Amino acid sequence: LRRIRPKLKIEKEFEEKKKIIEENLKEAEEEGEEEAAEKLKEALKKLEEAIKLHREGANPVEVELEEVTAIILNNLAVLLREGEEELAKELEKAIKLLEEKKDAPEEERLKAIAIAIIRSVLVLIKWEGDEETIEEIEEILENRENLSLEELREAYVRAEIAYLIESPEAAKKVREKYERGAPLEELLKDIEKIEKEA
């Protein structure tokens, strides 16, 4: 299957996101992977709560909270299809963090969503693979409360770059802009462009 973790701030997103989950469940039902197919039925479950809460009129901090929950859950069963249930435990903790903070302050909501996207980058790097940075980013998540949002979005920027290193050469260009101190809004534009590039 596939994994995509973007940045928010529209229905075309959940549109193309649903397309992945569909053929995923399509392949999950065509295959004996019924443990994954449950997550597939469970991923679209959180995608309805994502597409409903958007068309119902909630703020993006609650919509993406169910989108990422549908993103990771669609991504959780991919690791289950590959027998990577050891790494799938790391994404279930991200789900547990996503579910326990849906009744949390607006800043506590996106604070977990950032950790959710980061942890998903983290497990994908280990699956698709530069070593001390994992022992640098995974230790950042242990003290998740001692940090700010500007540091977690930077960590996702650093983590996504490290992943795209082990994916083009255009990742260190964004890393170069990180080293020049470029604004973090710009470090997202080129990063999400790379996701739009693929």
Side-chain angles (χ1 to χ4, degrees):
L1 318 180
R2 281 209 70 96
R3 294 171 31 101
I4 46 162
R5 315 154 312 270
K7 165 63 187 290
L8 267 285
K9 278 208 281 292
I10 173 62
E11 274 282 337
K12 309 171 186 177
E13 286 283 69
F14 324 115
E15 163 197 337
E16 61 158 323
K17 288 166 177 52
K18 207 182 307 174
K19 303 303 152 297
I20 309 177
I21 310 181
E22 295 151 14
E23 284 90 60
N24 290 7
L25 176 63
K26 183 180 89 72
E27 297 299 84
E29 291 171 346
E30 287 178 6
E31 301 164 18
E33 283 290 342
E34 298 181 356
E35 190 174 2
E38 168 206 343
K39 307 291 186 175
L40 262 306
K41 286 282 192 174
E42 192 170 332
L44 192 70
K45 163 189 177 62
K46 311 300 179 179
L47 186 58
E48 157 62 13
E49 303 181 24
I51 196 178
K52 170 213 305 176
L53 272 46
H54 175 239
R55 70 124 191 86
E56 188 173 339
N59 48 353
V61 76
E62 184 183 356
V63 178
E64 182 188 6
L65 192 145
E66 297 291 337
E67 163 192 329
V68 171
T69 312
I71 285 182
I72 292 187
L73 269 168
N74 173 86
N75 304 346
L76 171 71
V78 197
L79 298 177
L80 295 176
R81 190 204 185 278
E82 313 301 327
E84 295 288 343
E85 65 170 339
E86 45 185 352
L87 301 177
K89 298 175 194 302
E90 296 191 16
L91 288 190
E92 290 180 346
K93 301 185 306 176
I95 300 170
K96 286 183 170 58
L97 186 65
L98 281 173
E99 303 281 43
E100 75 175 357
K101 284 183 178 293
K102 68 189 301 297
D103 294 340
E106 175 194 9
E107 307 85 29
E108 286 276 28
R109 297 167 183 271
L110 42 73
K111 195 174 186 179
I113 300 170
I115 302 164
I117 294 190
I118 286 173
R119 178 48 60 112
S120 45
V121 180
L122 194 88
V123 309
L124 189 65
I125 292 178
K126 311 152 96 156
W127 183 27
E128 306 299 284
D130 291 334
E131 200 276 340
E132 192 74 24
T133 180
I134 299 180
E135 289 199 9
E136 152 73 8
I137 294 175
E138 85 166 20
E139 300 288 330
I140 284 304
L141 267 51
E142 301 180 3
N143 48 263
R144 57 161 192 86
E145 48 264 28
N146 300 20
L147 312 166
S148 187
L149 181 64
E150 196 72 10
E151 310 160 16
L152 267 54
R153 285 178 289 181
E154 161 178 337
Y156 160 65
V157 161
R158 290 168 40 94
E160 189 73 14
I161 287 173
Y163 159 70
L164 296 165
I165 288 178
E166 307 175 4
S167 67
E169 296 282 314
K172 296 300 283 185
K173 312 179 82 70
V174 185
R175 161 71 171 180
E176 162 191 348
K177 304 164 77 174
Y178 179 93
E179 299 168 3
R180 291 185 167 184
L184 287 78
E185 296 89 339
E186 188 185 23
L187 260 52
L188 294 175
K189 174 59 189 301
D190 43 16
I191 275 186
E192 287 307 318
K193 182 270 317 175
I194 295 163
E195 306 198 6
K196 188 55 160 158
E197 177 274 319

Coordinates of all heavy atoms in Angstrom, one line a residue, residues 132-192:
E132 N 22.2 8.2 13.9 CA 22.1 9.0 15.2 C 21.0 10.0 15.2 O 20.4 10.3 16.2 CB 23.5 9.7 15.5 CG 23.6 10.3 16.9 CD 23.9 9.2 17.9 OE1 24.4 8.2 17.5 OE2 23.6 9.5 19.1
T133 N 20.6 10.4 14.0 CA 19.4 11.3 13.9 C 18.1 10.6 14.3 O 17.2 11.2 14.8 CB 19.3 11.9 12.5 OG1 18.1 12.8 12.4 CG2 19.1 10.8 11.5
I134 N 18.1 9.3 14.1 CA 16.9 8.5 14.6 C 17.0 8.5 16.2 O 16.0 8.7 16.8 CB 16.9 7.1 14.0 CG1 16.8 7.2 12.5 CG2 15.8 6.3 14.6 CD1 16.7 5.8 11.8
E135 N 18.2 8.2 16.7 CA 18.4 8.3 18.1 C 18.4 9.8 18.6 O 18.6 10.0 19.8 CB 19.7 7.6 18.5 CG 19.6 6.1 18.5 CD 20.7 5.4 19.3 OE1 21.4 6.1 20.1 OE2 20.9 4.2 19.2
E136 N 18.3 10.7 17.7 CA 18.1 12.1 18.1 C 16.6 12.5 18.0 O 16.1 13.3 18.9 CB 18.9 13.0 17.1 CG 18.3 14.4 16.9 CD 18.4 15.3 18.1 OE1 19.1 15.0 19.0 OE2 17.9 16.5 18.0
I137 N 15.9 12.0 17.0 CA 14.4 12.4 16.9 C 13.6 11.5 17.8 O 12.6 12.0 18.4 CB 14.0 12.3 15.4 CG1 14.8 13.3 14.6 CG2 12.5 12.4 15.3 CD1 14.5 13.2 13.1
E138 N 13.9 10.2 17.9 CA 13.1 9.4 18.8 C 13.2 9.8 20.3 O 12.3 9.5 21.0 CB 13.5 7.9 18.6 CG 14.6 7.4 19.4 CD 14.7 5.9 19.5 OE1 14.2 5.2 18.6 OE2 15.4 5.4 20.4
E139 N 14.3 10.4 20.6 CA 14.5 10.9 22.0 C 13.8 12.2 22.2 O 13.4 12.6 23.3 CB 16.0 11.0 22.3 CG 16.7 9.7 22.3 CD 16.4 8.8 23.4 OE1 16.0 9.3 24.5 OE2 16.5 7.6 23.2
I140 N 13.6 12.9 21.1 CA 12.8 14.2 21.1 C 11.3 13.9 21.5 O 10.7 14.7 22.2 CB 12.9 14.9 19.8 CG1 14.2 15.6 19.7 CG2 11.7 15.9 19.6 CD1 14.5 16.6 20.8
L141 N 10.8 12.7 21.1 CA 9.4 12.4 21.3 C 9.2 11.9 22.8 O 8.1 12.0 23.3 CB 8.9 11.3 20.4 CG 8.2 11.8 19.1 CD1 9.1 12.9 18.4 CD2 7.9 10.6 18.2
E142 N 10.2 11.4 23.4 CA 10.1 10.9 24.8 C 9.7 12.1 25.8 O 8.9 11.9 26.7 CB 11.3 10.2 25.3 CG 11.7 9.0 24.4 CD 13.0 8.3 24.9 OE1 13.5 8.7 25.9 OE2 13.4 7.4 24.2
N143 N 10.3 13.2 25.6 CA 10.0 14.5 26.3 C 9.2 15.4 25.4 O 9.6 16.5 25.2 CB 11.3 15.1 26.8 CG 12.3 15.3 25.8 OD1 13.3 14.4 25.7 ND2 12.2 16.3 25.0
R144 N 8.0 14.9 25.0 CA 7.2 15.7 24.1 C 6.6 16.9 24.7 O 6.2 17.8 24.0 CB 6.1 14.8 23.5 CG 5.2 14.2 24.6 CD 3.9 13.7 24.0 NE 3.0 13.4 25.1 CZ 2.2 14.2 25.7 NH1 2.2 15.5 25.4 NH2 1.4 13.8 26.7
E145 N 6.5 17.0 26.0 CA 5.9 18.1 26.7 C 6.9 19.2 27.0 O 6.5 20.4 27.2 CB 5.2 17.7 28.0 CG 6.1 16.8 28.9 CD 5.8 15.3 28.7 OE1 5.4 15.0 27.6 OE2 6.0 14.6 29.7
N146 N 8.2 18.9 27.0 CA 9.2 20.0 27.2 C 9.5 20.8 25.9 O 10.5 21.5 25.9 CB 10.5 19.3 27.7 CG 10.4 18.5 29.0 OD1 9.2 18.2 29.4 ND2 11.5 18.3 29.7
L147 N 8.7 20.7 24.9 CA 9.0 21.2 23.6 C 7.9 22.2 23.2 O 6.8 22.3 23.8 CB 9.2 20.1 22.6 CG 10.2 19.0 23.0 CD1 10.1 17.8 22.1 CD2 11.6 19.5 23.0
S148 N 8.1 22.8 22.0 CA 7.1 23.7 21.5 C 6.7 23.2 20.1 O 7.2 22.2 19.6 CB 7.7 25.1 21.3 OG 6.7 26.1 20.9
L149 N 5.7 23.9 19.5 CA 5.2 23.5 18.2 C 6.2 23.9 17.1 O 6.4 23.1 16.1 CB 3.9 24.2 17.9 CG 3.2 23.9 16.5 CD1 2.9 22.4 16.4 CD2 2.0 24.8 16.3
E150 N 6.9 25.0 17.3 CA 8.0 25.4 16.3 C 9.1 24.4 16.3 O 9.8 24.3 15.3 CB 8.5 26.8 16.6 CG 9.2 27.4 15.5 CD 8.3 27.8 14.3 OE1 7.1 27.8 14.5 OE2 8.9 28.2 13.2
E151 N 9.3 23.6 17.3 CA 10.4 22.6 17.4 C 9.9 21.3 16.8 O 10.7 20.5 16.2 CB 10.9 22.4 18.8 CG 11.2 23.7 19.5 CD 11.2 23.6 21.0 OE1 11.3 22.4 21.5 OE2 11.2 24.6 21.7
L152 N 8.6 21.0 17.0 CA 8.1 19.7 16.5 C 7.9 19.8 15.0 O 8.1 18.8 14.2 CB 6.8 19.4 17.2 CG 6.8 18.4 18.4 CD1 7.8 19.0 19.4 CD2 5.5 18.2 19.0
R153 N 7.4 20.9 14.4 CA 7.3 21.1 13.0 C 8.7 21.1 12.4 O 8.9 20.6 11.2 CB 6.6 22.4 12.7 CG 5.1 22.3 12.8 CD 4.4 23.6 12.5 NE 4.6 24.6 13.5 CZ 4.2 25.8 13.5 NH1 3.4 26.2 12.5 NH2 4.4 26.7 14.5
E154 N 9.7 21.6 13.1 CA 11.1 21.5 12.6 C 11.6 20.1 12.6 O 12.3 19.6 11.7 CB 12.0 22.4 13.5 CG 13.5 22.0 13.4 CD 14.4 23.0 14.2 OE1 13.9 24.1 14.5 OE2 15.5 22.6 14.6
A155 N 11.2 19.3 13.7 CA 11.6 17.9 13.8 C 11.0 17.1 12.6 O 11.7 16.3 12.0 CB 11.2 17.3 15.1
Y156 N 9.8 17.4 12.3 CA 9.2 16.7 11.1 C 9.9 17.2 9.9 O 10.1 16.3 9.0 CB 7.7 17.1 11.0 CG 7.1 16.9 9.6 CD1 7.0 15.6 9.1 CD2 6.6 18.0 8.9 CE1 6.5 15.5 7.8 CE2 6.1 17.8 7.7 CZ 6.0 16.6 7.1 OH 5.5 16.4 5.8
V157 N 10.3 18.4 9.8 CA 11.1 18.9 8.6 C 12.4 18.1 8.6 O 12.8 17.6 7.5 CB 11.3 20.4 8.7 CG1 12.5 20.8 7.9 CG2 10.1 21.2 8.3
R158 N 13.1 18.0 9.7 CA 14.3 17.2 9.8 C 14.1 15.8 9.5 O 14.9 15.1 8.8 CB 15.0 17.4 11.2 CG 15.5 18.8 11.4 CD 15.9 18.9 12.9 NE 16.5 17.7 13.4 CZ 17.8 17.5 13.5 NH1 18.7 18.4 13.1 NH2 18.3 16.4 14.0
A159 N 13.0 15.2 10.0 CA 12.7 13.8 9.8 C 12.3 13.5 8.4 O 12.8 12.5 7.8 CB 11.7 13.3 10.8
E160 N 11.5 14.3 7.8 CA 11.1 14.1 6.4 C 12.3 14.2 5.5 O 12.4 13.5 4.5 CB 10.0 15.1 6.0 CG 9.4 14.8 4.7 CD 8.4 13.6 4.7 OE1 8.1 13.1 5.8 OE2 8.1 13.2 3.6
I161 N 13.2 15.2 5.8 CA 14.4 15.3 5.0 C 15.3 14.0 5.1 O 15.7 13.5 4.1 CB 15.2 16.5 5.5 CG1 14.6 17.8 5.0 CG2 16.7 16.4 5.0 CD1 15.2 19.0 5.5
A162 N 15.4 13.5 6.3 CA 16.2 12.3 6.5 C 15.5 11.1 5.8 O 16.2 10.2 5.3 CB 16.3 12.0 8.0
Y163 N 14.2 11.1 5.7 CA 13.5 10.0 5.0 C 13.8 10.2 3.5 O 14.2 9.2 2.8 CB 12.0 10.0 5.2 CG 11.2 9.4 4.1 CD1 11.3 8.0 3.9 CD2 10.5 10.1 3.2 CE1 10.6 7.4 2.9 CE2 9.7 9.5 2.2 CZ 9.8 8.2 2.1 OH 9.1 7.6 1.0
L164 N 13.6 11.4 2.9 CA 13.8 11.7 1.5 C 15.3 11.5 1.1 O 15.6 11.3 -0.1 CB 13.3 13.1 1.2 CG 11.8 13.3 1.4 CD1 11.5 14.7 1.4 CD2 11.1 12.5 0.3
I165 N 16.2 11.5 2.1 CA 17.6 11.1 1.8 C 17.6 9.6 1.5 O 18.3 9.2 0.5 CB 18.5 11.4 3.1 CG1 18.7 12.9 3.2 CG2 19.8 10.6 2.9 CD1 19.6 13.3 4.4
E166 N 16.9 8.8 2.2 CA 16.8 7.3 2.0 C 15.6 6.9 1.2 O 15.1 5.8 1.4 CB 16.9 6.6 3.3 CG 18.0 7.0 4.2 CD 17.9 6.3 5.6 OE1 17.0 5.5 5.8 OE2 18.8 6.6 6.5
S167 N 15.1 7.8 0.3 CA 13.9 7.5 -0.5 C 14.3 6.6 -1.6 O 13.4 5.9 -2.1 CB 13.3 8.8 -1.0 OG 14.2 9.4 -2.0
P168 N 15.5 12.1 -3.2 CA 16.4 12.6 -4.2 C 17.6 13.3 -3.6 O 17.7 13.4 -2.4 CB 15.5 13.6 -5.0 CG 14.1 13.2 -4.7 CD 14.1 12.7 -3.3
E169 N 18.4 13.9 -4.4 CA 19.5 14.8 -4.0 C 18.9 16.2 -3.6 O 19.6 17.0 -3.0 CB 20.6 15.0 -5.0 CG 21.3 13.7 -5.3 CD 22.4 13.4 -4.2 OE1 23.1 14.3 -3.8 OE2 22.4 12.2 -3.8
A170 N 17.7 16.5 -3.9 CA 17.0 17.7 -3.6 C 16.6 17.8 -2.1 O 16.0 18.8 -1.7 CB 15.8 18.0 -4.5
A171 N 16.8 16.8 -1.3 CA 16.5 16.8 0.1 C 17.5 17.6 0.9 O 17.2 18.4 1.7 CB 16.4 15.4 0.6
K172 N 18.8 17.5 0.5 CA 19.9 18.2 1.2 C 19.8 19.7 0.8 O 20.4 20.5 1.6 CB 21.2 17.6 0.9 CG 21.4 16.2 1.5 CD 21.3 16.2 3.0 CE 22.5 16.7 3.7 NZ 22.4 16.5 5.2
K173 N 19.2 20.0 -0.3 CA 19.0 21.4 -0.6 C 18.0 22.1 0.4 O 18.3 23.2 0.9 CB 18.4 21.6 -2.0 CG 19.1 20.8 -3.1 CD 18.4 20.9 -4.5 CE 18.9 22.2 -5.1 NZ 20.3 22.2 -5.6
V174 N 17.0 21.4 0.8 CA 16.1 21.8 1.9 C 16.9 21.8 3.2 O 16.7 22.6 4.1 CB 14.8 21.0 2.0 CG1 13.9 21.6 3.0 CG2 14.2 21.0 0.6
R175 N 17.7 20.7 3.4 CA 18.6 20.7 4.5 C 19.6 21.9 4.5 O 19.9 22.4 5.6 CB 19.4 19.4 4.6 CG 20.6 19.3 5.4 CD 20.3 19.4 6.9 NE 21.5 19.1 7.7 CZ 21.5 19.1 9.0 NH1 20.4 19.3 9.8 NH2 22.6 18.9 9.7
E176 N 20.1 22.2 3.4 CA 20.9 23.4 3.2 C 20.1 24.7 3.7 O 20.7 25.5 4.4 CB 21.4 23.6 1.8 CG 21.9 25.0 1.5 CD 22.1 25.2 0.0 OE1 22.1 24.2 -0.8 OE2 22.3 26.4 -0.4
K177 N 18.9 24.8 3.3 CA 18.1 25.9 3.8 C 17.8 25.8 5.3 O 17.7 26.9 5.9 CB 16.8 26.0 3.0 CG 17.0 26.0 1.5 CD 15.7 25.7 0.7 CE 14.7 26.9 0.7 NZ 13.5 26.6 -0.2
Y178 N 17.7 24.6 5.8 CA 17.7 24.5 7.3 C 18.9 25.0 7.9 O 18.9 25.6 9.0 CB 17.4 23.0 7.6 CG 17.4 22.7 9.1 CD1 16.2 22.7 9.8 CD2 18.5 22.5 9.8 CE1 16.1 22.5 11.1 CE2 18.5 22.2 11.2 CZ 17.3 22.2 11.8 OH 17.2 21.9 13.2
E179 N 20.1 24.8 7.3 CA 21.3 25.2 7.9 C 21.5 26.7 7.8 O 22.2 27.3 8.7 CB 22.5 24.5 7.2 CG 22.5 23.0 7.4 CD 23.4 22.2 6.5 OE1 24.2 22.9 5.8 OE2 23.5 21.0 6.6
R180 N 21.0 27.3 6.7 CA 21.0 28.8 6.6 C 20.0 29.5 7.5 O 20.0 30.7 7.5 CB 20.8 29.2 5.2 CG 21.9 28.8 4.2 CD 21.7 29.4 2.8 NE 22.9 29.3 2.0 CZ 23.0 29.8 0.8 NH1 21.9 30.3 0.2 NH2 24.1 29.6 0.1
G181 N 19.3 28.7 8.3 CA 18.3 29.3 9.2 C 17.0 29.8 8.5 O 16.3 30.6 9.1
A182 N 16.7 29.4 7.3 CA 15.6 29.8 6.6 C 14.3 29.6 7.4 O 14.2 28.7 8.2 CB 15.5 29.0 5.2
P183 N 13.3 30.5 7.2 CA 12.1 30.3 8.0 C 11.4 29.0 7.8 O 11.5 28.4 6.7 CB 11.2 31.5 7.4 CG 11.7 31.8 6.1 CD 13.2 31.6 6.2
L184 N 10.8 28.5 8.9 CA 10.2 27.2 8.9 C 8.9 27.1 8.0 O 8.6 26.0 7.6 CB 9.8 26.8 10.3 CG 11.0 26.4 11.2 CD1 11.7 27.7 11.8 CD2 10.6 25.5 12.4
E185 N 8.3 28.2 7.7 CA 7.2 28.2 6.7 C 7.8 27.8 5.3 O 7.1 27.2 4.5 CB 6.5 29.5 6.7 CG 5.7 29.8 7.9 CD 6.6 30.6 8.9 OE1 7.8 30.5 8.8 OE2 6.0 31.3 9.8
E186 N 9.0 28.3 5.0 CA 9.6 27.9 3.8 C 10.1 26.5 3.7 O 10.1 25.8 2.7 CB 10.8 28.9 3.5 CG 11.4 28.8 2.1 CD 12.6 29.7 1.9 OE1 13.2 30.1 2.9 OE2 12.9 30.0 0.7
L187 N 10.6 26.0 4.9 CA 11.1 24.6 4.9 C 9.9 23.6 4.8 O 10.2 22.4 4.5 CB 11.8 24.4 6.3 CG 13.3 24.4 6.2 CD1 13.8 25.6 5.6 CD2 13.9 24.2 7.7
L188 N 8.7 24.1 4.9 CA 7.5 23.2 4.6 C 7.2 23.3 3.1 O 6.7 22.3 2.5 CB 6.3 23.7 5.4 CG 6.4 23.4 6.9 CD1 5.2 24.0 7.6 CD2 6.6 22.0 7.2
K189 N 7.3 24.5 2.5 CA 6.9 24.7 1.1 C 7.7 23.7 0.2 O 7.1 23.0 -0.7 CB 7.1 26.1 0.6 CG 6.9 26.4 -0.8 CD 5.5 26.0 -1.2 CE 5.3 26.0 -2.7 NZ 5.6 27.4 -3.3
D190 N 9.0 23.7 0.3 CA 9.8 22.8 -0.5 C 9.6 21.3 -0.1 O 9.7 20.4 -0.9 CB 11.3 23.2 -0.4 CG 11.7 23.5 1.0 OD1 11.0 23.1 1.9 OD2 12.8 24.1 1.2
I191 N 9.3 21.1 1.2 CA 9.1 19.7 1.6 C 7.8 19.2 1.1 O 7.7 18.1 0.5 CB 9.1 19.6 3.1 CG1 10.6 19.4 3.6 CG2 8.3 18.4 3.6 CD1 10.7 19.2 5.1
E192 N 6.7 19.9 1.2 CA 5.4 19.5 0.7 C 5.4 19.5 -0.8 O 4.6 18.8 -1.5 CB 4.3 20.3 1.3 CG 4.0 20.0 2.7 CD 3.7 18.5 3.0 OE1 3.0 17.9 2.1 OE2 4.2 18.0 4.0

